[PDB]
Amino acid sequence: PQLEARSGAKAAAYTPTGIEHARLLPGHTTLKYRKF
Amino acid sequence: VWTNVEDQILKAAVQKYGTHQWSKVASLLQKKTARQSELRWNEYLNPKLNFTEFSKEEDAQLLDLARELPNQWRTIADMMARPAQVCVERYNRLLEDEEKEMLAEARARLLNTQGKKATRKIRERMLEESKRIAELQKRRELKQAGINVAIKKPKKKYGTDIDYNEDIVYEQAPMPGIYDTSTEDRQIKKKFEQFERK
Amino acid sequence: SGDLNLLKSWNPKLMKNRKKVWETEQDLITEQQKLNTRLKEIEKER
Amino acid sequence: MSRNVDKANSVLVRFQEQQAESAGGYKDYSRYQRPRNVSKVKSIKEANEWKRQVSKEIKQKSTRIYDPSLNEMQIAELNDELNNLFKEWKRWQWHID
Amino acid sequence: ILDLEELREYQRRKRTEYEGYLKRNRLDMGQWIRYAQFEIEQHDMRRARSIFERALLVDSSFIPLWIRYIDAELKVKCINHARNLMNRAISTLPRVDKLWYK
Amino acid sequence: LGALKYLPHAILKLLENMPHPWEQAKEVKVLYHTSGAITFVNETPRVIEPVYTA
Amino acid sequence: LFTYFREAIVATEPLLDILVKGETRIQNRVKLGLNSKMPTRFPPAVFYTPKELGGLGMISASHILIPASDLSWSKQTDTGITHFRAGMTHEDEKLIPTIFRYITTWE
Amino acid sequence: VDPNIADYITAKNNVVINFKDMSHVNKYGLIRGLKFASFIFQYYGLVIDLLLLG
Amino acid sequence: KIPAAVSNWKNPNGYTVALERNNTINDGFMKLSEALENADKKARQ
Amino acid sequence: SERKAINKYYPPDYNPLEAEKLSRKMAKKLKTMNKSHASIRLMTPFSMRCLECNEYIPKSRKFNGKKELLKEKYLDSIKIYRLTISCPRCANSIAFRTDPGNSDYVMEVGGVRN
Amino acid sequence: LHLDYNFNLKPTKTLTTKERKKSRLGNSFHLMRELLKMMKLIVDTHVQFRLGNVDAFQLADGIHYILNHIGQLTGIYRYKYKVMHQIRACKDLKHIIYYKFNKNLGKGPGCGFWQPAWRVWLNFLRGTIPLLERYIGNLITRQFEGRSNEIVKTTTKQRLDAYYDLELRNSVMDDILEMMPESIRQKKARTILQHLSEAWRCWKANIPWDVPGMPAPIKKIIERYIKSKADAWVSAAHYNRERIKRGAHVEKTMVKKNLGRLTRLWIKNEQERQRQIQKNGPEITPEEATTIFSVMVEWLESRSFSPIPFPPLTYKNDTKILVLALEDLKDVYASKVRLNASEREELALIEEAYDNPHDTLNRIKKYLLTQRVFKPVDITMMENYQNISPVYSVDPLEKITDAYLDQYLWYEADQRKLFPNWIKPSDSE
Amino acid sequence: LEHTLFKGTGFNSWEGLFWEKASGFEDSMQFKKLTHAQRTGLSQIPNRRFTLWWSPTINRANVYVGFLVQLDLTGIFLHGKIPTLKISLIQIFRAHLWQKIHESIVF
RNA sequence: GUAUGUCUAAAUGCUCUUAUUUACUAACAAAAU
Distance between CA atoms of residues B74 and B65, nearest Å:
11
Distance between CA atoms of residues C6 and C17, nearest Å:
11
Provide φ and ψ at J54, rounded to 5°: 55, 30
CA distances from F17 to F29, G89, K38, K69 (A): 10, 43, 15, 20
Beta bridge partners of J42: J63
For J45, residues 6+ apart whose C-beta sits below 8 A from its C-beta are C5, C11, C13, J59, J60, J105
Closest CA to F27 of F49, F45, F7: F45
Helix E4-24 crosses helix E30-42 at what angle (to 10 degrees)?
Answer: 170
Distance between CA atoms of residues B169 and E49, nearest Å:
8
Which ranges of chain C does DSSP label H, i.e. alpha helix? 15-45
Q: Which nucleotide is nearest to L41 (CA to C1')?
A: M33
Beta bridge partners of H22: H19
With 0-12 / 13-18 / 19 or more C-beta atoms within 10 angstroms meaning exposed / middle / buried, residue B16 is buried
Closest residue, chain K, to E27 (C-alpha): K186
* Chain center to CA of K123: 42
Q: Does residue L73 come out as left (phi exceeding 0), alpha (psi in the -120 to 50 range) or beta?
A: left
Distance between CA atoms of residues K95 and K89, nearest Å:
10
How many angstroms separate the first and last alpha carbons of chain E?
37
Distance between CA atoms of residues L35 and L28, nearest Å:
13
> Helix, strand, coil proportions of chain D in percent (round to 5)?
60, 0, 40
What string of DSSP letters covers chain E?
A: --SHHHHHHHHHHHHHHHHHHHHH-SS-SHHHHHHHHHHHHHT-HHHHHHHHHHHHHH-SS-HHHHHHHHHHHHHTT-HHHHHHHHHHHHHH-SS-SHHHH-
Closest residue, chain K, to D15 (C-alpha): K13
Distance between CA atoms of residues I33 and K387, nearest Å:
37
- With beta carbons less than 8 A apart as the criterion, state whether H38 and K399 touch: no
CA atoms within 13 A on the CB side of E83: 10
CB neighbour burial string for I10-38, b if at least 16 within 10 angstroms, e if fewer: ebeeeebeeeebeeebeebbbbbbebbee
Provide φ and ψ at K247, rounded to 5°: 105, 70
**Dihedral angle sign, alpha carbons of residues B35, B36, B39, B45:** negative
Rounded, the Å distance between the CA of B34 and C1' of M33 is 32
Distance between CA atoms of residues J31 and J49, nearest Å:
34
For G62, residues 6+ apart whose C-beta sits below 8 A from its C-beta are G19, G20, G23, G24, G87, G88, G89, G96
What string of DSSP letters covers chain H?
A: --HHHHHHHHHHHS-EEEETTEEEE--SS--SSSTTHHHHHHHHHHHHHHHHH-
Distance between CA atoms of residues D62 and D52, nearest Å:
15
| Domains of chain D by residue range | 1-97
Distance between CA atoms of residues K399 and E78, nearest Å:
84
Let me know how long chain E is.
102
* Chain center to CA of L13: 17
Contacts of L68 in chain K (CB under 8 A): 72-73
Distance between CA atoms of residues J111 and J54, nearest Å:
9
CA distances from H19 to E59, I7, K393 (A): 47, 19, 11
Distance between CA atoms of residues J17 and J6, nearest Å:
21
CA atoms within 13 A on the CB side of L76: 26
With 0-12 / 13-18 / 19 or more C-beta atoms within 10 angstroms meaning exposed / middle / buried, residue B54 is middle
What string of DSSP letters covers L62-91?
A: S-SS--EEEPTTSS-EEES--HHHHHHHHH
Q: Does A7 touch chain E (CB under 8 A)?
A: yes
How was this structure determined? It was done by cryo-EM
CA atoms within 13 A on the CB side of L79: 20
Closest CA to G19 of G85, G70, G104: G85
Closest CA to K212 of J89, I5, F38: I5
Q: Does L25 touch chain C (CB under 8 A)?
A: yes
Closest CA to K412 of K305, K331, K319: K305
Distance between CA atoms of residues L82 and G36, nearest Å:
7
Distance between CA atoms of residues K54 and L21, nearest Å:
56
Q: Which nucleotide is nearest to D6 (CA to C1')?
A: M24
Which residues does H contribute to its contact with K (CB < 8 Å)? 1-2, 4-5, 7-9, 11-12, 15-29, 31-36, 38-39, 42-43, 45-47, 49-51
Closest residue, chain L, to G36 (C-alpha): L82
CA atoms within 13 A on the CB side of E61: 5
> Helix, strand, coil proportions of chain L in percent (round to 5)?
35, 5, 60
Closest residue, chain K, to F3 (C-alpha): K137
Q: How many CB atoms lie within 10 A of CB F22?
A: 7
- With beta carbons less than 8 A apart as the criterion, state whether F7 and K38 touch: no
- With beta carbons less than 8 A apart as the criterion, state whether B29 and B102 touch: yes
Beta bridge partners of J48: J57, J113
Q: Which nucleotides on strand M sit less than 7 A from a protein beta carbon?
A: 1-11, 13-15, 20-33
Distance between CA atoms of residues K324 and K361, nearest Å:
13
For L28, residues 6+ apart whose C-beta sits below 8 A from its C-beta are C18, C22
Show the CA angle centred on residue L7, arms to residues L6 and L10, nearest 5°. 105
In the sheet that holds H16-19, the strands lie side by side as: H22-25, H16-19, K377-382, K389-393
Contacts of J112 in chain B (CB under 8 A): none
Q: Does E19 touch chain B (CB under 8 A)?
A: yes
Closest residue, chain B, to J61 (C-alpha): B116
Q: Which nucleotide is nearest to K20 (CA to C1')?
A: M2
Q: Are residues F21 and K43, on separate chains, in Cβ contact within 8 Å?
A: no
Rounded, the Å distance between the CA of D1 and C1' of M23 is 8
Nearest to J2 among K4, K13, K24 (CB): K24
Which ranges of K51-109 does DSSP label H, i.e. alpha helix? 56-73, 83-101
Closest CA to E64 of K184, K276, K181: K184
Distance between CA atoms of residues K297 and E33, nearest Å:
86
Distance (Å) from the C-alpha of residue B50 to the closest C-alpha of chain J? 37
Contacts of D11 in chain J (CB under 8 A): 19-20, 23
Interface test with L, best of C26, C28, C29, C30 (most L CBs within 10 A): C26
Q: How many CB atoms lie within 10 A of CB K1?
A: 15
Closest residue, chain K, to F19 (C-alpha): K46
Distance between CA atoms of residues K74 and K66, nearest Å:
9
Distance between CA atoms of residues E31 and E9, nearest Å:
21
Which residues does F contribute to its contact with K (CB < 8 Å)? 1-2, 4-9, 11-12, 14-16, 18-21, 25
Closest CA to G58 of G32, G35, G28, G83: G28
| Domains of chain B by residue range | 1-198
Distance between CA atoms of residues F25 and F10, nearest Å:
19
> Helix, strand, coil proportions of chain A in percent (round to 5)?
0, 0, 100
Chain I contacts in chain B segment 52-81 (CB below 8 A): 67-69, 79, 81
Closest CA to K352 of K332, K326, K318: K326
The strand ranges marked E within K169-231 are none
Beta bridge partners of H16: H25
- With beta carbons less than 8 A apart as the criterion, state whether G16 and G64 touch: yes
Distance (Å) from the C-alpha of residue B187 to the closest C-alpha of chain I? 48
Structure's resolution in angstroms: 3.8
Measuring alpha carbon to C1', the residue closest to nucleotide M6 is B128
CA atoms within 13 A on the CB side of A4: 7
Contacts of E27 in chain A (CB under 8 A): 7-8
Nearest to B79 among I8, I23, I34 (CB): I23
Which residues does D contribute to its contact with J (CB < 8 Å)? 3, 5, 8-9, 11-12, 14-15, 17-19, 30-33, 69, 72, 74
Nearest to C24 among J75, J98, J99 (CB): J75
For K428, residues 6+ apart whose C-beta sits below 8 A from its C-beta are none
Distance between CA atoms of residues G47 and G49, nearest Å:
6
Q: Which nucleotide is nearest to J68 (CA to C1')?
A: M22
For K11, residues 6+ apart whose C-beta sits below 8 A from its C-beta are J1, J5, J8, J9, K1, K2, K23
Contacts of E28 in chain K (CB under 8 A): 186
Q: What is the DSSP letter of J83?
A: E
Q: Does K140 touch chain A (CB under 8 A)?
A: no
Which ranges of K247-395 does DSSP label H, i.e. alpha helix? 252-279, 286-303, 318-333, 341-355, 357-370
Distance between CA atoms of residues K300 and K321, nearest Å:
26
Q: Are residues J42 and C8, on separate chains, in Cβ contact within 8 Å?
A: yes
Q: Does J9 touch chain D (CB under 8 A)?
A: no
Nearest to L65 among K77, K333, K336 (CB): K77
Q: Which nucleotide is nearest to D3 (CA to C1')?
A: M2
Show the CA angle centred on residue K193, arms to residues K189 and K195, nearest 5°. 115
**Amino acid (one-letter) located at I10:** K
Q: Are residues H14 and B70, on separate chains, in Cβ contact within 8 Å?
A: no
Distance between CA atoms of residues K297 and H10, nearest Å:
19
Distance between CA atoms of residues J62 and J64, nearest Å:
7
D40 SS3 class: coil
* Beta strands at J96-97 and H16-19: parallel, antiparallel or unpaired: unpaired
For E49, residues 6+ apart whose C-beta sits below 8 A from its C-beta are B171, E72, E73
Q: Does residue L80 come out as left (phi exceeding 0), alpha (psi in the -120 to 50 range) or beta?
A: left
Beta bridge partners of B20: none
Rounded, the Å distance between the CA of L100 and C1' of M18 is 14
H helix or E strand, kind and range, residue J62: strand J62-69
Q: What is the DSSP letter of B44?
A: I
Provide φ and ψ at E25, rounded to 5°: -90, 75
